[PDB]
Design an enzyme around this catalytic site. Structure first.
Site, mmCIF file in Angstrom:
data_model
loop_
_atom_site.group_PDB
_atom_site.id
_atom_site.type_symbol
_atom_site.label_atom_id
_atom_site.label_comp_id
_atom_site.label_asym_id
_atom_site.label_seq_id
_atom_site.Cartn_x
_atom_site.Cartn_y
_atom_site.Cartn_z
ATOM 1 N N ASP A 124 5.369 75.245 70.952
ATOM 2 C CA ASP A 124 5.441 73.820 71.216
ATOM 3 C C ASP A 124 6.144 73.102 70.081
ATOM 4 O OD1 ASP A 124 4.067 71.909 73.593
ATOM 5 O OD2 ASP A 124 3.857 70.934 71.670
ATOM 6 N N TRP A 125 5.599 71.956 69.678
ATOM 7 C CA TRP A 125 6.115 71.134 68.608
ATOM 8 C C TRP A 125 6.130 71.937 67.306
ATOM 9 C CZ3 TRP A 125 9.253 67.278 67.823
ATOM 10 C CH2 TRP A 125 9.549 66.394 68.873
ATOM 11 N N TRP A 175 2.644 66.390 82.275
ATOM 12 C CA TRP A 175 2.149 66.462 80.906
ATOM 13 C C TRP A 175 2.266 65.103 80.219
ATOM 14 C CZ3 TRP A 175 0.529 70.489 77.292
ATOM 15 C CH2 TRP A 175 0.840 70.317 75.946
ATOM 16 N N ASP A 260 3.224 79.051 82.153
ATOM 17 C CA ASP A 260 3.628 77.789 81.584
ATOM 18 C C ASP A 260 4.705 77.164 82.432
ATOM 19 O OD1 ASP A 260 4.029 75.620 80.018
ATOM 20 O OD2 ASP A 260 4.864 76.703 78.334
ATOM 21 N N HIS A 289 0.719 77.440 78.719
ATOM 22 C CA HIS A 289 1.387 76.869 77.572
ATOM 23 C C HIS A 289 0.744 77.214 76.221
ATOM 24 C CE1 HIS A 289 4.191 73.944 75.685
ATOM 25 N NE2 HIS A 289 3.174 73.232 75.194
HETATM 26 CL CL LIG Z 1 5.037 66.817 73.893
#
Ligand SMILES: [Cl-]
EC number: 3.8.1.5
Length: 310
Positions: A124-125, A175, A260, A289
């Site tokens: 992710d981030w 999301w 995901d 995810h």
């Molecule tokens: Cl995000």
């Protein structure tokens, strides 16, 4: 200077499966008066450092199942909480959070702790940001464990890294809607929806850091930044692609959470080709995810892959 608030210590009293001691820093260059929390597990004098980066809308608690496995292997493990999450301080204005704000905190942390022989662990981030670090000081990075993540590049250079924003409708669109719209955002309910195998207890650990909405500005901003990429983000992520493709000479292990809807296979296969020497990915069929939720296994398999080259 930067108006921030801090979550009361009592909110973390009752945490499930998180027996790691807190470490804090409030003297980082560029972040005055702001206290960052990070875990520092295993042998502090270890040669290998596992730098575990979390994403939206989580915290180091997310790596709780991988930390002991990497520590037990003889490595030091660092798992920092970004400002606005976990036990770190939380700037109250959404405008304070930007891609460079978070990226420069990491370069600061890395210098402050003098981290070397880094095995970068991202998702992710943690990966949008984390994959732009090695080019800033390539001598400190030696391996990469990558789960569902990519680069925040422009739509034309890499359409795969932009297409998911708009489709499908129950993907990033859903999301982002769940995150930035409610005026009463309950993280435990959001996590239970996006990581259906969490227990009630585990879900509750994800809401722990935010007593009310005033503590959630960073949580609100991350999804907006995936949607509206500023110029620095774009230029920096675009230069990272060149690093991974031509400069990278480390060992890489890739794991894909197959369920995901956000950064699954249509994003992971393309990332795999830009990473020089990336081997075949470990596909985890039951994982969504939050691949870390199925972490023990990713930790074990990657150590096993990296041992087979030492
Ligand atoms: Cl995000």
């Amino acid at each position: 200077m930067i108006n921030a608030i801090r979550t009361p210590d009592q909110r973390f009293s009752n945490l499930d499966q998180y027996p790691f001691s807190p470490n804090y820093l409030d003297d980082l260059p560029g972040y005055p008066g702001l206290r960052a929390h990070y875990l520092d597990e295993g042998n502090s004098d270890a040669e290998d450092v596992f730098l575990c980066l979390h994403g939206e809308p989580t915290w180091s608690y997310l790596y709780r199942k991988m930390i002991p496995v990497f520590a037990e292997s003889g490595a030091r493990v660092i798992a920092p909480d970004f400002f606005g999450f976990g036990k770190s301080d939380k700037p109250v204005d959404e405008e304070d959070y930007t891609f460079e704000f978070h990226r420069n905190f990491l370069l600061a942390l890395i210098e402050r702790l003098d981290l070397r022989n880094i095995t970068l662990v991202v998702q992710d981030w943690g990966g949008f940001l984390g994959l732009t670090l090695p080019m800033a000081d390539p001598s400190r990075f030696k391996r990469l464990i990558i789960m569902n993540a990519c680069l925040m590049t422009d739509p034309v250079t890499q359409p795969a890294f932009s297409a998911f924003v708009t489709q499908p409708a129950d993907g990033f669109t859903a999301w982002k809607y769940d995150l930035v719209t409610p005026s009463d955002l309950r993280l435990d309910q959001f996590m239970k929806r996006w990581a259906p195998t969490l227990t009630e207890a585990e879900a509750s650990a994800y809401a722990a850091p935010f007593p009310d909405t005033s503590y959630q500005a960073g949580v609100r901003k991350f999804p907006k930044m995936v949607a509206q990429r500023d110029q620095a983000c774009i230029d920096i992520s675009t230069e990272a692609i060149s690093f991974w493709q031509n400069d990278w000479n480390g060992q890489t292990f890739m794991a894909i959470g197959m369920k995901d809807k956000l950064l699954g296979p249509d994003v992971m296969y393309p990332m795999k080709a830009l990473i020089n020497g990336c081997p075949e990915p470990l596909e985890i069929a039951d994982a969504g995810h939050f691949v870390q939720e199925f972490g023990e296994q990713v930790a074990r398999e990657a150590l096993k892959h990296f041992a087979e080259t030492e």
